Amino acid sequence: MNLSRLKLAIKYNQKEFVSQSNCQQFLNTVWFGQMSGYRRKPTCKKIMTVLTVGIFWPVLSLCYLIAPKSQFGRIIHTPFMKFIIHGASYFTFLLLLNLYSLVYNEDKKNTMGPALERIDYLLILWIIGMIWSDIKRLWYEGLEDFLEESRNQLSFVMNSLYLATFALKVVAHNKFHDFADRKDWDAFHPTLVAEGLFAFANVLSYLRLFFMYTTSSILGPLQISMGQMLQDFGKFLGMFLLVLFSFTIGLTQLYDKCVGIFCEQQSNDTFHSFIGTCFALFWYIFSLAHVAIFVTRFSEELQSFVGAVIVGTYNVVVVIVLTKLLVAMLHKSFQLIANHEDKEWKFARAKLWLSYFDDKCTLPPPFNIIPNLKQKRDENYQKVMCCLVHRYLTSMRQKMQSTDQATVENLNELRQDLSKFRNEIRDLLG
């Protein structure tokens, strides 16, 4: 089962071809593989099966790692299963991240360059494995294709930042192993940087899970639909940026003559710098009163008033005029999207499924680290193609014949016939 054409279809973005029932049927058969009854089992039984497979994902993986021929080793082959096993692996990883702080790093609050707790070490393995997977994938498939789909693109940064985090940790453990109070640490102390980067990666890791939505028939369409509209936001972004800076400049010009929006008592310092002016206006966007109207100067009434007008106008333009527009755009956008959601979702899910169809990737990340006839084929293809072509022609013939409505031309043609017959007879009979 090379599934060459199927793959070329996805390459050439043949969404309709991929969403045609005949193709969907073929796919499902392959996806569930021998686990066909799965389709028939009642929701309850299916739910149970899925959970069971996932829980023992390491065990099943091990079986394949040891006796791929074993019935269990075979279980991982079923594309559907691999998905479950690989999905569980990721979830366990996310768990490790969660238990990293909630239930660890309890006495290293003030230890600069802290040691590498086992959690860190384990996580390391997973990160490595996930990286390797990307490489292998990028290798086999290619580059642009790999970069095209998001789960991969996020997988790059995520893995990157994760890599940096652990690196800096090693450097810190060496250079700075002090045990001073956290407060006394320099703002850019390696440990501080690592923790910040690690945290951000954690956000990215979870966001990645969005891909799984495609599989669900309920939330999958919506997930895809949202992504579609996520493009039209870009347009709005450009417009807003211009507005943000336009007003930023003016505010700074009128005000440049503990500190910032982020303090209990918001200071006019919000406008003193430029970046601050940007932040300050940024929070106004949300229209939930994140920044007070204290644009007043310490004292300059006029100067303070004009400032109020400037900020007020910004709010009216952005919070009201621009936003409502955004909604309008989204509304129109979704309408059209709603029309083809099925096709789009199907194509997406298929692209996802095929990834598992391959035999190249079988082992979840943590384990993954552990490493002529042609004439006949063509002949048959031609036979089948001949049939499909004939069927197509006949079918189209019938469809048109039974749908295409008569036209004035046809009427006129008929009337001509009646006339010609009329005349002919009239002449033949004087």
């Binding site: 969907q24 049927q25 990215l204 989204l330």
Partner: protein, 686 residues
């Protein structure tokens, strides 16, 4: 350069003689065709069974032009008639009679299509009747999940064929005409089939649309038969027919079970139900709104009186009054409202109870509330008993009833556990966090929320709030789906922020006013613990989280900046992106929902009305203190069904004739008709 164009799908070409023969058939020159046939016999220069490049042989070309004369001529001579019956059925000609009467690869029909199936797929009552007259059979479609039969478990041989074959049988079984002609209870079968098709749509994901289309077809058929009723006698005979007491609106009930919404909403059906609902108030429709209002008010006020009379002597005139459904509804609504008023009094100095008596004695108000609570629970028990867990569970509101009742029970239990083990009266501030009394009060309040929200159910009754309620409920589903997406967003950022600030957590003691958390005058440690993080991000959606919650005490610029960026991104994604998308999504949904609100609302209202039509009913406070006949009934039903089916067939034809453009093929036939007439006349006159 140039791109060469060569024919690769090589195909043999028809001899000039052959080609000519085919052309004559298309023009209807019986003579020329006749001559050609005769000559070919003697001379053998043209295969009478030749075919156009488009696969149109002579018999087929004749059938499409519907020239039965030429058809007979061709058939008389030995012309292959393979699959011709099928073409004559697809085209829906009644020249099928001729082919059936004669009886002596690259097919446009799959190997599974049998004449009866194709006729059914076409829905030609006549053509179908012909075939059915001769013994005909459509294979049984093994039930869903019939994998047990190795027969179906051998789908491995050819799945696509199996699936397609299955759809073809159902596409046939679900034809309104075949169900009219072959089924004993056309209405019941359509109900059942509709359901099965629905279920299959789910199991067979591919072909989902197809199965769903078929189900709607079955649902429409049943409604249409109902619409063909011309007297109330017929409507009763139909709606009160029990397959196997009677006179219980049995089929109306089965229709509600199978979600046959349209059937239930049919005008006539609604009218009958209304008469039963408003019994005791004839002309209630004509009653002035004010008058109505007055009547309702009085009855509700006297609800206790009516409730008792029944208990004492159901036979009593008064006893009789509460039995009427509309009354039951009004009485039962008043009881609930009274209950809710009791709940309101509980929060007042109506009884002015002390607030330091741990394990206090139940107040009078609480005492009075108890009976009702008991009635509500008892009602639920009966509901479960009288309806089975399935029905009870199915109902969404039974879920809320359960929750409300369960809380109103834990409240009682905790109250008791507190009367005992707590005879003192220590200061409220001294009471521990989980003092039973405190927990009890909490549960009671939560339930008071649920109880007052149950009133939304009553809206289904009004003609204005009802449809609105239904539409909103549908939209709620959409919102639920969005929340799932959002949730992942929340979780992501929650973990990130917690992972960044968990180091900088501080003891509540350190905090001002010994308060630690987002719900403190000075919001502090909002991201220190995960749970706080989730809550904090949740509140930030409502702009109740201050921005000074992102600054670490030690003032580490880098960390604070990363945090602020993370918080800001969350706010953009949630408030500016997801929120706005939800709005657009919802806009679309409402447009669609609005269209079917009526059928959705009426179905809902009918279920409500039906609930009261039943006999077992008393308000919650006072809630806890022949073969012969069958045959005749069935005969009457069959009589009505015969009439309805007849009326339906005729109406559908009329609609098809009065609402269908003249396709091109139709024109072609007319042209061929003139052509044939011409040739004939020319010959006779020449």
């Amino acid at each position: 350069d140039r791109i060469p164009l060569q024919i690769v799908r090589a195909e043999t070409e028809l001899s000039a003689e052959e080609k000519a023969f085919l052309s004559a058939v298309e023009k209807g020159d019986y003579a020329t065709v006749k001559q050609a046939l005769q000559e070919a016999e003697i001379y053998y220069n043209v295969n009478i069974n030749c075919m156009d490049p488009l696969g149109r042989s002579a018999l087929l070309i004749a059938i499409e032009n519907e020239n039965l004369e030429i058809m007979e001529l061709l058939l008389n001579h030995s012309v292959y008639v393979g699959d011709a019956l099928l073409y004559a059925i697809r085209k829906e000609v009644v020249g099928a009679v001729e082919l059936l009467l004669s009886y002596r690869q690259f097919s446009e029909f799959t190997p599974d299509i049998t004449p009866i199936m194709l006729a059914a797929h076409t829905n030609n009552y006549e053509i179908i009747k012909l075939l059915v007259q001769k013994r005909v059979t459509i294979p049984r479609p093994h039930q869903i999940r019939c994998n047990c039969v190795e027969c179906v478990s051998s789908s491995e041989v050819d799945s696509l064929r199996h699936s397609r074959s299955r759809l073809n049988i159902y596409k046939a079984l679900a034809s309104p005409s075949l169900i009219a002609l072959s089924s004993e209870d056309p209405i019941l079968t359509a109900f059942r089939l509709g359901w099965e098709l629905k279920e299959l749509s789910k199991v067979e994901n591919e072909f989902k649309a197809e199965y769903e289309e078929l189900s709607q077809q079955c649902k429409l058929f049943a409604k249409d038969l109902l619409d063909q009723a011309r007297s109330s006698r017929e409507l009763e005979i139909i709606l009160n027919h029990r397959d196997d007491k009677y006179h219980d609106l049995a089929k109306l009930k089965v229709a509600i079970k199978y979600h046959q919404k349209e059937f239930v909403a049919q005008p006539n059906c609604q009218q009958l139900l209304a008469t039963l609902w408003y019994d005791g108030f004839p002309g209630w429709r004509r009653k002035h709104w004010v008058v109505k209002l007055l009547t309702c008010m009085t009855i509700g006020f006297l609800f206790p009186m009516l409730s008792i009379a029944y208990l004492i002597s159901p036979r009593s005139n008064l006893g009789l009054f509460i039995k009427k459904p509309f009354i039951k509804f009004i009485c039962h609504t008043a009881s609930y409202l009274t209950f809710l008023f009791m709940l309101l009094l509980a929060s007042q100095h109506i009884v002015r109870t002390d607030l330091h008596v741990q394990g206090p004695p139940p107040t009078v108000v609480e005492w009075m509330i108890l009976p009702w609570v008991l009635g509500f629970i008892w009602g639920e028990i009966k509901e479960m008993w009288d309806g089975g867990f399935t029905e009870y569970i199915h109902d969404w509101w039974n879920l809320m009833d359960f929750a409300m009742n369960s809380l109103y029970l834990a409240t009682i239990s905790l109250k008791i556990v507190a009367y005992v083990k707590y005879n003192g009266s220590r200061p409220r501030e001294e009471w521990e966090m989980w003092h039973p009394t405190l927990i009890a009060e909490a549960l009671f309040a939560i339930s008071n929320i649920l109880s007052s929200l149950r009133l939304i159910s009553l809206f289904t009754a009004n003609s204005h709030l009802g449809p609105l309620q239904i539409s909103l409920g549908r939209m709620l589903l959409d919102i639920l789906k969005f929340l799932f997406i959002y949730c992942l967003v929340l979780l992501a950022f929650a973990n990130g922020l917690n992972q960044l600030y968990f180091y900088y957590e501080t003891r509540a003691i350190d905090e001002p006013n010994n308060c630690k958390g987002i719900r403190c005058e000075k919001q502090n440690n909002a991201f220190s613990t995960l749970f706080e993080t989730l809550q904090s991000l949740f509140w930030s959606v409502f702009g109740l989280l201050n921005l000074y919650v992102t600054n670490v005490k030690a003032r580490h610029e880098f960390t604070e900046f990363v945090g602020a960026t993370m918080f800001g991104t969350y706010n953009v994604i949630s408030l500016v992106v997801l929120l706005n998308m939800l709005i657009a999504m919802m806009n679309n949904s409402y447009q669609l929902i609005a269209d079917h609100a009526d059928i959705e609302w009426k179905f809902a209202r009918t279920k409500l009305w039906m609930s009261y039509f039943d006999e077992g009913g008393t308000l919650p406070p006072p809630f806890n203190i022949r073969h012969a006949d069958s045959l005749i009934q069935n005969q009457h039903y069959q009589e009505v069904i015969r009439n309805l089916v007849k009326r339906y067939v005729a109406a559908m034809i009329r609609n098809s004739k009065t609402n269908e453009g003249l396709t091109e093929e139709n024109f072609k036939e007319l042209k061929q008709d003139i052509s044939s007439f011409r040739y004939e006349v020319l010959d006779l006159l020449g």
